[model samples]
Target: GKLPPGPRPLPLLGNLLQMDRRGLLKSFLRFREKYGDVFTVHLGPRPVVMLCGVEAIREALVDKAEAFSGRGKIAMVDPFFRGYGVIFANGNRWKVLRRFSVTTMRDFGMGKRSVEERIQEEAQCLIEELRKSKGALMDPTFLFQSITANIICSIVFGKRFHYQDQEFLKMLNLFYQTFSLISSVFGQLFELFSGFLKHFPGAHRQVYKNLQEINAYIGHSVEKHRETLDPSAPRDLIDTYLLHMEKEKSNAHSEFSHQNLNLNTLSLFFAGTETTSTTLRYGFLLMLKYPHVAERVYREIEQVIGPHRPPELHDRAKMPYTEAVIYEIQRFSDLLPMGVPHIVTQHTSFRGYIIPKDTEVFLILSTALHDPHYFEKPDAFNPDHFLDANGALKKTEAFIPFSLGKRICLGEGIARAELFLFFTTILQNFSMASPVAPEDIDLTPQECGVGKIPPTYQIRFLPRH
Candidate 1:
């Protein structure tokens, strides 16, 4: 299979010299502008096929789902995950684990009213924490981190820890550090030159260390659940999985095991924690930047949930303006801009280009998010991109923040509920004012690579009368 035509590579350096080191996404888009959507770039010795816009991304990931569903080589996580968890694994291991995860998360009330109650219950906890601020200067970073972490913790651990608990900190730290590292310059370089670079020492190694500690932590919980496991009553994800492990113990080829359990638990915990919190963190940052957008979101919450009560997922139907703002939040902030790397599961022909099996591909999702064809004012932080003339929320397939196809975010249901509920509920009770003048507020990510880090800013959460 012939690789797609792209910038001619120099031996070893490939296209590295041609790209702006810090502006990775911009570099990809630059190439897309010249070479067309499905162009190739050599990262070190590896060939990465870059797919841009909705049509090309969909044709491969959606229409020919299976062929392109193989998870690509993620340099940061490869040392630890090594195709073990649902996030990084391929083939039957991924299929089996992903099915168990999606089904189990459903059984545990994700996307259902039961979990909304759980989110509402915890959101009240967040409100209480905010109340202590008394509108004083604060950064919502750690608070939002734990609040988001608590949701997945409760589901996976069968209980939630107090905000300041040591146990909670360990769980939160793994996601934070792993994400921070992945977005750093060293991490991006590691992705391109991992084969040679892993031998040298750097801050990038912390991800492996963090994963080991998290694995130990997950293993501790597994033993606790295993010893207390009752066949008749399964309390949480860990318990149910423990029971399933027992069932599958006889199958030597089964993906279910203590090893997969820890990896699966870690996968769910990280997914359920980082992505939504970062979105909410970015949401608040955007709110501070454009107070008008924040004002409208607050007003919509006032009109819908009112001061008398908290928000429910059902209210999402009645609050288009607020919904539009949230959609804009996910779209404009553009988390996972490069999307996760995906590979062709087999040697296959796509769009007249033959991509060999297991070759890494980058579905540059930011291209889709900002695809001018689907969005109005894609470069501006405008909520109307998601709104119709009548002011109701509009839908666009280009809003692929969660990525797409068979490997779409497993926690996407939980993430949507969390983002809407958390963002709206917080705004319902308070106005988030920035310490700086609105115009001075910077919305550029503190770090941008595989992930987007919200800029650190002072916020005053003034309670409503």
Candidate 2:
């Protein structure tokens, strides 16, 4: 089979010169002009096979997954994930840890009571924080990140942190700063060319510096957990892993280690924090842009939850439109613009192309979430895309905001619970409007703002009438 068509590459630069210097996703999408759905592009010397459309991505990731292993580099994530956690590992190591972690999540009620309570509690705290604003125009992103991070904290450490605490703020800033432009490019470049440019003055140093702080923080947490661990007592992810070590003592190759524990915990932090917060941030921002939709959501929250506090899962059924809005937000706002890259472990055929081992591949998440074939108005912010004519919420086959297949987001269930809980909770107590009035709020987000950008608005949350 012929290799998927791609742009002609220069000797060394490959297709790098064709990329949009401003937006990485824009550049990736632009390649579609020359390569359609399945194509190849090179960043420096690396040849990347880009997979577009849901069918193509699903085929490789789910159908023929045995041939397409989790490969490639999340350069910055490698340090945080350490090539040991579910997000970065492969083969037996990934299988063992992933199985154990998934089982642990299920046992701890990832989609059930154990994790649900933690999410609800965090949701309550989020409600209180919104209440404290007394309708003040707060960005809400930082506040949401704090509460979401606390949920992960509760799972990992069996406790939560104060948002203003010095250590807590430092940890939070470390992750945020690392997501900055310079930091991301630094990681991308570093992954492309190993620590070769460490001394090069730029975001590279800040990326390393930020990771050092996070690593230090996790180190202290591990020490704390170790001091408390006992065969008789088990608390959180840390304890669960420690228990795994005890259970697998006979296997010398088993990846149960203090270093792995720290790395896994940090990976959870990265996976769980910004994604949820940013989605909600975008959700409300979209609400502001489309006031009618926001008004409908506000009404739904009042109808189902009423003056009796924030919404709970039970309320989900009663508020179909509200849920529809959340789904639309996930579909509309382009988060995880391009899904994480997957690698071919051996020669494989996909969409009639020969994929050789170690071939870098991509999963186009944006394609499925916004597929014109799947959504009636792919470009418009329409919640009806997930709702039938009668207004009942419906599920679309292509509405996969969290991605699909084996490596789909492990925290997806947890993140969904958080989004619904946090979203409805806020709508319960206050009113929402764009920071710059509906007419002025820019729907398109800038690089600097958190997640999907929301016009910073301080709508007063007066007690519900």
Q: Candidate 2 lDDT, tens digit per residue, 1-465?
A: 866788888877667678776445567778886678888877667888888788887787789978876656665455445577667777777787678777766576333347777787777776676666665656665776798899888878778998668778777767766665333544555544544454566665666677777878888878887788976667777888888877877977768876667777777887788788767778777777688887788877767778666567778888889889889888888677666767778888877788788888877788788788889779888999889889999987787777777777888888888888888777676667534677776766655211233334444454455
Measured by TM-score, how close is model 2 to the native structure? 0.92
In model 2, the runs with Cα more than 4 Å from the true position are 79-82, 109-113, 182-199, 249-251, 448-462
By lDDT, the best candidate is: 1
Kindly report which residue pairs in candidate 1 clash with one another.
none
